[PDB]
Amino acid sequence: AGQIQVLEGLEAVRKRPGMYIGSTSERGLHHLVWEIVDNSIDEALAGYANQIEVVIEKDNWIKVTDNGRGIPVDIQEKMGRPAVEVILTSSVVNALSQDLEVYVHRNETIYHQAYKKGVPQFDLKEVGTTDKTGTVIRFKADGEIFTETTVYNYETLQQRIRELAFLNKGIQITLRDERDEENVREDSYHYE
Secondary structure (H helix, E strand, O other), X not given: OHHHHHHHHHHHHHHOHHHHHOOOOHHHHHHHHHHHHHHHHHHHHOOOOOEEEEEEEHHHEEEEEEOOOOOOOOEOOXXXXXXXXXXXXXXXXXXXXXXXXXXXXXXXEEXXXXXXXXXXXXXXXXXXXXXXXXXXXXXXXXXXXXXXXXXXOHHHHHHHHHHHHXXXXXOEEEEEEOOOOOOOEEEEEOOO
């Protein structure tokens, strides 16, 4: 029933995306970034993170990295699935992305899963080791949903990132545009 309810949720979000994120215009595209960054900010507010990095990657992928606890990976009695899988298969960003990848650094281990339109492409796997904790989410917005544009505006991202750092003092939040490898721009904000 659990995994059935997952698939139905994905279908629901992709049928009426504007009901979930306000619009499928440039505004809604940027809302994807906010949803992910908001979750990292909660982890800092909980006492466990203090650095968030947003990278606009080649072809308008977005990568958001935080140094929090890592999304948990323990198998849920609820779903029989890893917690991270449950969390990400119920995410609007994941549903509205053509592709999305997660790397969790936790338990001295790096765990990876990938998704398309919210559907896991393989079971969560151990890919490496680590001495850090945190979460990396990389996604590519689905152009079948975002029919006007899938191109981010640096100044839009910058203005809100600066506002978020000012509002949440002590969190370092960095924005980097890597879309043109010959001119990489970075702005980093850290209030008191």
